[PDB]
């Protein structure tokens, strides 16, 4: 059939891509990073503990001032936290109790959330009428939202569980563009530093580098072997790290277009759910389901540190923009902040 | 020493007071998940969400009909639920083997392992008339080796073949539920159809809360 010759062509194209990736694969990152000293036993320890929520904390996002931090829990609350002095700022009640994501705006003005209600809701913090108000209620995805990140004050990128990411204009209220091409639920996205091309990890073990100003998937990465639960761009925007239910992290490179490092371990049989880099880009923090987190060395692939702590599975993890602290949020209603 | 930061800490204490009030209204509400492949318009008589009240107990029902069928990521979010009201058309093609696999995947998923399942078998009159004019034995060869349990109460009026098929489906769900379980969560089957099924959900949820309170005193 003609479908058969199209599948033969797609198989030839996978062969051509694998050949091109093999041709540019001279020395792995484990090889040319033997001459670097390791980091050592990093005794990161709980500094603050933001014990305010009622249900499990499902997501978290820091402010860009490195002090405020939104946590969204599934008690229907989303509360901004002042990390430096562990006191609340706002406590926003939501519409649907099941939010699966949140996002603090880089301008600090808005906070997004969204979940099983298939709607990214954007709350306005800096209103002159007192209490926070839902400023925008973006409803175009057909499945649940899984992650959302503000590009700037005016436009928000979302990913949903209906194989679509989407760039939305908030002032108008609809999708500026879509991003289709996934075959499973898109569990997370991560912006670049220059905020021009982001990545998305999904439930088909494939991370896509999209282009925001066009809408086309320009690169596609297949290293993992189960549903990618988290993704985070490297601090220069040339690489990114992922993690999945296959108990591994994977550092991919955009320009090299293939997988560079596979952070796995024998004692790790639990899926992982949240990754972030430190400010240098050396510690790949990765929160797992075995109630711990792990401070991998992005160049030695050794477990440089192990974040202890949480009493139920960590669910989200975020490093401040000045790299000062790492906040983890778990299903035991607690946020931990680590230095 | 907290110049106007005192007023910020006082604001945060008022926030904590409001969240204490929300905790008091939160744990007094029983979240339960309606998951099936009507049974829902018999409940609001007193689109996703539902808040109803039985005997001054707040029950909270979320339906997930506006998602896709890839269930494995959005069903983790209901780990803090009190019960999964599972609905299966008892005359399902073979949709009910899909229902058995869905129940088994609910029952064994490592975040739903503390969640009891209220099992509803709708369309029992459809199964009754299908076995009457019949079908089910073509799908299930293990149904030949099956005997109706003696403690199984006969619903007065229905055929014995209806009872043996009915309690076969019930006990087969029970076999899939008890094949792997630490006693940490059970299954509560019923048979609907029409009248108020919500009394069974009330009694069931009270059974789940009581078994959890008993086995957190090591009494079970």
């Amino acid at each position, epitope marked *: 059939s003609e479908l058969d010759q199209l599948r033969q062509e797609a198989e030839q194209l996978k062969n051509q891509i694998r050949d091109a990736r093999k041709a540019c694969a001279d020395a792995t990152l484990s090889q040319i990073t033997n001459n670097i000293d390791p980091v050592g036993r990093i005794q990161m320890r709980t500094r603050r503990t933001l014990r305010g929520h009622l249900a499990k904390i499902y997501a978290m996002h820091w402010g860009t001032d490195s*002090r*405020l931090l939104v946590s969204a829990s599934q008690d229907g609350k989303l509360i901004i936290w*002042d990390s430096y*002095t562990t006191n609340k*700022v*706002h406590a926003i009640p939501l519409r649907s109790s099941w939010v699966m994501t949140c996002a603090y705006a880089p301008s*600090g003005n808005y906070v997004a959330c969204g979940g099983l209600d298939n709607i990214c809701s954007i709350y306005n913090l*800096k209103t*002159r*009428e*007192g*209490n926070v108000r839902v400023s925008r209620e973006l409803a175009g995805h057909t499945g649940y939202l899984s992650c959302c990140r503000f590009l700037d004050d005016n436009q928000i990128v979302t990913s949903s569980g209906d194989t679509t990411c989407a760039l939305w204009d908030i002032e108008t209220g609809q999708q500026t563009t879509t991003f289709t091409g996934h075959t499973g639920d898109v569990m997370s996205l991560s912006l670049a530093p220059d905020t021009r091309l982001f990545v998305s990890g999904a439930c088909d073990a494939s991370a896509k580098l999209w282009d925001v100003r066009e809408g086309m998937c320009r690169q596609t990465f297949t290293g993992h072997e189960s549903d990618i639960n988290a993704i985070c761009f490297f601090p220069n925007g040339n690489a990114f790290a992922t993690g999945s239910d296959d108990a591994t992290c994977r550092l991919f490179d955009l320009r090299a277009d293939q997988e560079l490092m596979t952070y796995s371990h024998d004692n790790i049989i639990c899926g992982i759910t949240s990754v972030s880099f430190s400010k240098s880009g050396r510690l790949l923090l990765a929160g797992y389901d075995d109630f711990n987190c792990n401070v991998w060395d992005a160049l030695k692939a050794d477990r440089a540190g192990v974040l202890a702590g949480h009493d139920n599975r960590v669910s989200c993890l975020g490093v401040t923009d000045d790299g000062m602290a790492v906040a983890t949020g778990s299903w035991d209603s607690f946020l931990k902040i680590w230095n | 020493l907290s*110049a*106007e*930061d*005192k*007023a*910020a800490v*006082e*604001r945060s*204490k*008022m926030i904590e007071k409001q969240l204490q009030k929300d905790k008091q209204v939160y744990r007094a509400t029983h979240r339960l998940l309606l998951l099936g492949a009507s049974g829902k318009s018999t409940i609001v008589k007193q689109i996703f969400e539902t808040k109803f009240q039985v005997d001054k107990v707040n029950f909270h029902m979320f339906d997930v009909g506006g998602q896709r069928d890839e269930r494995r990521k959005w069903i983790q979010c209901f780990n803090d639920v009190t019960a999964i009201i599972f609905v299966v058309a008892s005359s399902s093609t073979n949709r009910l083997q899909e229902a058995l696999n869905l129940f088994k995947s609910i029952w064994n998923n490592r975040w739903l392992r503390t969640i009891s399942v209220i099992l509803f078998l709708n369309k029992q009159d459809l199964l009754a008339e299908k076995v009457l004019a019949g079908k089910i034995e073509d799908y299930f060869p293990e149904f030949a080796r099956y005997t109706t349990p003696e403690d199984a109460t006969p619903e007065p009026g229905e055929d014995p073949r209806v009872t043996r098929a009915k309690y076969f489906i019930r006990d087969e769900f029970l076999r899939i539920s008890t094949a792997s379980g630490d006693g940490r969560h059970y299954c509560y089957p019923h048979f609907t159809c029409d009248t108020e099924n919500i009394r069974r959900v009330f009694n069931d949820c009270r059974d789940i809360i009581q078994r959890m309170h008993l086995r957190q005193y090591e009494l079970l």
Partner: single-chain antibody, 232 residues
Framework: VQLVESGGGLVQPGGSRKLSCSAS????????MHWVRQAPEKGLEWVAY????????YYADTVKGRFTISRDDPKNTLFLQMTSLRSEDTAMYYC??????????????WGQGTTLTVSSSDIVMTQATSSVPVTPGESVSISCRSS???????????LYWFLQRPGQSPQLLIY???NLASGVPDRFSGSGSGTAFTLTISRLEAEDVGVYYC?????????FGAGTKLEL
């Protein structure tokens, strides 16, 4: 967005009144509320403060005991019960909205106030100048001095700057010595360190002539300056 004070007039000394402040246009129950008065030919000075949820009440020393502030959060209403009036309590009284969270902008909205006349230690904010002549276009800079270093440990220099146009409610210009308030045009700027403060209207234009007040907010009682007036 809306505060209306009520209950002014002329009262014999020793008596008692109740100034009421009806708030409409914002969620009233989450704002610290200040009463701030002004003698009719002098500058502003603070009277009282009730917090959000009425759990913290401060008074000025000169009214401590004589006055009593409360609020009805369902009625969105602020109450100043004034007993044992003196001649000095003749003032224009102002109901000031003020929220205190991180990065919040307190003292940003001010009611019209009421005239209440009577017919029969602390931080000292030294204002620099009584009055200064101003033409349009220049960078009019006016200073202010503290008697105690407003730089706290957490780096929050608690100095507020207030425009008051003539016959107008004194609105906020600058909170915490460097931050412009909402709706303030860009021509205003604030600088300085502990006990050395500077408001600067670079690129001056009209609708700007007023009295500029210099509020300490490091500790209660909140004291102002004598105010510097711009002219033409």
């Amino acid at each position: 967005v809306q505060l209306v004070e009520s209950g002014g007039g002329l009262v014999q000394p020793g008596g008692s009144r109740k100034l009421s402040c009806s708030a409409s246009g914002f969620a009233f129950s989450s704002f610290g509320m200040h009463w701030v008065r002004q003698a009719p030919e002098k500058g502003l000075e603070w009277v009282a403060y009730i917090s959000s949820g009425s759990g913290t009440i401060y008074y000025a020393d000169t009214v401590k005991g004589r006055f009593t502030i409360s609020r009805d959060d369902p009625k969105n209403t602020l109450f100043l019960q004034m007993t044992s009036l003196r001649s000095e309590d003749t003032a224009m009284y102002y109901c000031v909205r003020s929220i205190y969270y991180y990065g919040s902008s307190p003292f940003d909205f001010w009611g019209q106030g009421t005239t209440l006349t009577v017919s029969s230690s602390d931080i000292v904010m030294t204002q620099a100048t009584s009055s200064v002549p101003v033409t349009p276009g220049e960078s009019v800079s006016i200073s202010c001095r503290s008697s105690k270093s407003l730089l706290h440990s957490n780096g929050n220099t608690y100095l507020y700057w207030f425009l008051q146009r003539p016959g107008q409610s004194p609105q906020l210009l600058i909170y915490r010595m460097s931050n412009l308030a909402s709706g303030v045009p860009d021509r205003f700027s604030g600088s300085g360190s502990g006990t050395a403060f500077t408001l600067t209207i670079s690129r001056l234009e009209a609708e700007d002539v007023g009295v500029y007040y210099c509020m300490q907010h490091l500790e209660y009682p909140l004291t102002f300056g004598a105010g510097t007036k711009l002219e033409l």
